[PDB]
Amino acid sequence: QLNPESADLRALAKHLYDSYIKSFPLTKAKARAILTGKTTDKSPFVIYDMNSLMMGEDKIKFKHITPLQEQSKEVAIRIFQGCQFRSVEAVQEITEYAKSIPGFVNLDLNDQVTLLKYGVHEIIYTMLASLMNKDGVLISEGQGFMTREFLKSLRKPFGDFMEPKFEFAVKFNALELDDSDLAIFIAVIILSGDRPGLLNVKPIEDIQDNLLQALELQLKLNHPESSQLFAKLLQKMTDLRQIVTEHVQLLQVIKKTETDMSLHPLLQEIYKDL
Amino acid sequence: ESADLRALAKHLYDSYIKSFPLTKAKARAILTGKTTDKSPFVIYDMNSLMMGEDKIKFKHITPLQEQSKEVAIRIFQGCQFRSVEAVQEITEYAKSIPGFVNLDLNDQVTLLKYGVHEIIYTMLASLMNKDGVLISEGQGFMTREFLKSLRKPFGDFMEPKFEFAVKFNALELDDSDLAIFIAVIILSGDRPGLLNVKPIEDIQDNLLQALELQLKLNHPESSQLFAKLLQKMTDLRQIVTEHVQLLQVIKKTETHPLLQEIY
Numbered sequence A: 001q002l003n004p005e006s007a008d009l010r011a012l013a014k015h016l017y018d019s020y021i022k023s024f025p026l027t028k029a030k031a032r033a034i035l036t037g038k039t040t041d042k043s044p045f046v047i048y049d050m051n052s053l054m055m056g057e058d059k060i061k062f063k064h065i066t067p068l069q070e071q072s073k074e075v076a077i078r079i080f081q082g083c084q085f086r087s088v089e090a091v092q093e094i095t096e097y098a099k100s101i102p103g104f105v106n107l108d109l110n111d112q113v114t115l116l117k118y119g120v121h122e123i124i125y126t127m128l129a130s131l132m133n134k135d136g137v138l139i140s141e142g143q144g145f146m147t148r149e150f151l152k153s154l155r156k157p158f159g160d161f162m163e164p165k166f167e168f169a170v171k172f173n174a175l176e177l178d179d180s181d182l183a184i185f186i187a188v189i190i191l192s193g194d195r196p197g198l199l200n201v202k203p204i205e206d207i208q209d210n211l212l213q214a215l216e217l218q219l220k221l222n223h224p225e226s227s228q229l230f231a232k233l234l235q236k237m238t239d240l241r242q243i244v245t246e247h248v249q250l251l252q253v254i255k256k257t258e259t260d261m262s263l264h265p266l267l268q269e270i271y272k273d274l
Numbered sequence B: 001e002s003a004d005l006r007a008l009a010k011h012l013y014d015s016y017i018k019s020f021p022l023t024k025a026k027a028r029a030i031l032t033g034k035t036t037d038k039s040p041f042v043i044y045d046m047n048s049l050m051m052g053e054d055k056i057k058f059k060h061i062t063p064l065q066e067q068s069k070e071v072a073i074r075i076f077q078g079c080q081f082r083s084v085e086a087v088q089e090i091t092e093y094a095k096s097i098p099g100f101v102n103l104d105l106n107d108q109v110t111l112l113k114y115g116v117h118e119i120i121y122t123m124l125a126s127l128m129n130k131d132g133v134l135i136s137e138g139q140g141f142m143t144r145e146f147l148k149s150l151r152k153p154f155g156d157f158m159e160p161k162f163e164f165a166v167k168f169n170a171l172e173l174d175d176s177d178l179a180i181f182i183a184v185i186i187l188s189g190d191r192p193g194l195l196n197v198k199p200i201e202d203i204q205d206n207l208l209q210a211l212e213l214q215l216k217l218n219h220p221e222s223s224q225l226f227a228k229l230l231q232k233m234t235d236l237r238q239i240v241t242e243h244v245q246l247l248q249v250i251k252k253t254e255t256h257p258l259l260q261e262i263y
């Protein structure tokens, strides 16, 4: 049945699902409902071109997003800027979620930061998977949907920063994970141990050890139907590393062809040295 | 199938033992000391190398005259030769894996083209320790520092593999564990260009169940080892991508036609 052992683990699972919902306004469940239908009130405004993009800015909040680097002739940059701000947003949330992870705050302050430094993007693109389908991605809190095609056609460099994300989202979404799973999986990602510079690695590993244990049970209980989902899920941590690095490559490029474009501080401190 | 995962294991093990000459247990026998007389010829610098030329006569990879005149070039040169040696040992082990032969010819090739690198490094860990690597069927042992001691790009083509070994070996896996682990890497359903992924995954899924059981029985003590091992698969891709990058700069050197073709 259930033993004292598994029980501790299910409680950890529930504690995290609870923090998860409390930290991310736009969950996978909400996003799915928005993407699939079953709705009359949650349908998004679709953007697939400059005009729709134009009427787009109109129906939805596209200026508290585009930092003051406003009216910047090339739309591509405007878009990129929207994306960047939304990432800073995500970092913040993830940071909020992190603190709730049992044991995380009790660590060396420099390490707390190190885990965030590298775990953050791997997480953003994991969660970003939740707002995408092969056709495109949700934006502005779900109120909108930008076509994968619109993005892919943007100015030479820019029109290339989202494809990898889409490539992964398709694979990853095929795992059919739900919000309660992702909450634990994201936890595991934070408590790595192989992050560069980690002063006291051991305590971090004992934490992750319990999380992996929590995820194993969770996946087994939530997805009997799917065998070795646990394994298949972990293997996916490879795709994340590469997506991350490709992006970084891209930031390098932009930091030159566009020396007039600004960068958000928080995103700066993260990137440096990845 | 509680018993099936055990049979797939012994079989893979049995097969692994037959395909690979230098095993973990053995390589371990050497390195350390435990039951050893044969003791390896250490290569820590230039002259210890030279003496190696004719001693271990490891030169299976050097008789290559008029092109055998510049240390850092012949070592890496050699390294590659032993790689190609490993590839054949791997390709052969592949055929032992239940179902491998039954897959589409082109996919068998593809799994191999994109999997041998990751496996070369996993087994290479068996021949390393923080201070060096076992060469020529374990007759020698080339020191770690002498390698960083290599001039130009040649000073960091083994260092990465060394860092990996250190972390990997920390798992204390044996040949029994590795055998199944190797099979998993091969049966990767996400290699580019495949044609029929289902059969592959079906097999990897079966191999994964075997590994999981193997690790629990062989290491009751070590909690979540299965998880930690699968994570290392990530360490590998980084390493294989990176390695492949050094090959780029390496294009800018030494400035036979069949030799290249060979490689």
Ligand SMILES: */C(=C(\CCC)[N+](=O)[O-])c1ccc(-c2cccc(C(=O)O)c2)o1
Pocket (backbone or CB within 6 Å): A061, A062, A065, A079, A082, A083, A084, A086, A087, A090, A124, A128, A137, A138, A139, A140, A141, A146
């Ligand atoms: C990049 C991602 C960022 C995820 C943290 N995203 O799809 O949200 C991206 C691509 C396009 C946009 C975007 C364009 C215009 C307006 C917005 C908005 O949130 O208002 C986002 O962001």
Ligand SMILES: */C(=C(\CCC)[N+](=O)[O-])c1ccc(-c2cccc(C(=O)O)c2)o1
Pocket (backbone or CB within 6 Å): B058, B059, B074, B075, B076, B078, B079, B080, B082, B083, B084, B086, B120, B124, B127, B133, B134, B135, B136, B137, B142, B158
């Ligand atoms: C590189 C590794 C790669 C194995 C597939 N290795 O052979 O352990 C490497 C480093 C040094 C050498 C080497 C130099 C000279 C002679 C030999 C030999 O095996 O006889 C190896 O290879």
